[PDB]
Design a binder for this molecule. Structure first.
Ligand code: YKJ
Length: 207
């Protein structure tokens, strides 16, 4: 397992998301589903020119999996996934520019719910999670696990868990007072409210 330091900009955004008082936390789900949808759009478009792109899995879907025992909510997609370079370098670049733009918008009067317009909606996960674990598999690399509980660092290591084929799993280790997002009625409510028109099947698993 390798440990990396977040750059100042993104580290500051993570602290803002965790420290700022903001009750409309439910928007985190909309943001993660949108990220999954975007990733599914990407692998699907690539498959239009090269059908073999789907040899790692033809199914294009999004699954929402709650687990009360582990107190986790996992958003699973069979999108394009992320390579090690995406995890460490490429997305670091996006996180920096996206954070700078978002911060300037906030000081102007923008709201936290608009975070997705800046390409860093993934970080809205910290509105409800104390730790986020990302398991991902891209056609051009092996399966990896990215993880962070903030505090200025994140880790990346090869993942020996169940082979995914292709895609991304965002595991939200929920804060003690955010267990409402593990309830079927709550998740169904949020999905219908903000993600009813997503162009891929969203399956809400139950326990
Ligand atoms: N293709 C995908 C991608 C996603 C997705 O949401 N992607 C995340 C994301 C979105 C925007 C900016 C950074 C990151 C990031 C980072 C990440 N943030 C960083 C900040 C600084 N340095 C490296 C960094 N890596 C690490 C893991 C996941 C993500 C979902 C499904 N399919």
């Amino acid at each position: 397992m390798e440990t990396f330091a977040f750059q100042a900009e993104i580290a500051q955004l993570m602290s803002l998301i965790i420290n700022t008082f903001y009750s409309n936390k439910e928007i985190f789900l909309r943001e993660l589903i949108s990220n999954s949808s975007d990733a599914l759009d990407k692998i699907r478009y690539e498959s239009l020119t090269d059908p073999s792109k789907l040899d790692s899995g033809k199914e294009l879907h999004i699954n929402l999996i709650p687990n009360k025992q582990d107190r986790t909510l996992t958003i699973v997609d069979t999108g394009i996934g992320m390579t090690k370079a995406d995890l460490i370098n490429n997305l670091g670049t996006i996180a920096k520019s996206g954070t700078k733009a978002f911060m300037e918008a906030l000081q102007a009067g923008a709201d936290i719910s608009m975070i997705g317009q800046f390409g860093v909606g993934f970080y809205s996960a910290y509105l409800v999670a104390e730790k986020v674990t990302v398991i991902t598999k891209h056609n051009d690399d092996e399966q990896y696990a990215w993880e962070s509980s903030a505090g200025g660092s994140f880790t990346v290591r090869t993942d020996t868990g169940e082979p995914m084929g292709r895609g991304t799993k965002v595991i939200l280790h929920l804060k003690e007072d955010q267990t409402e997002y593990l309830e079927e009625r709550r998740i169904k409510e949020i999905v219908k409210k903000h993600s009813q028109f997503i162009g891929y099947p969203i399956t809400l698993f139950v326990e």
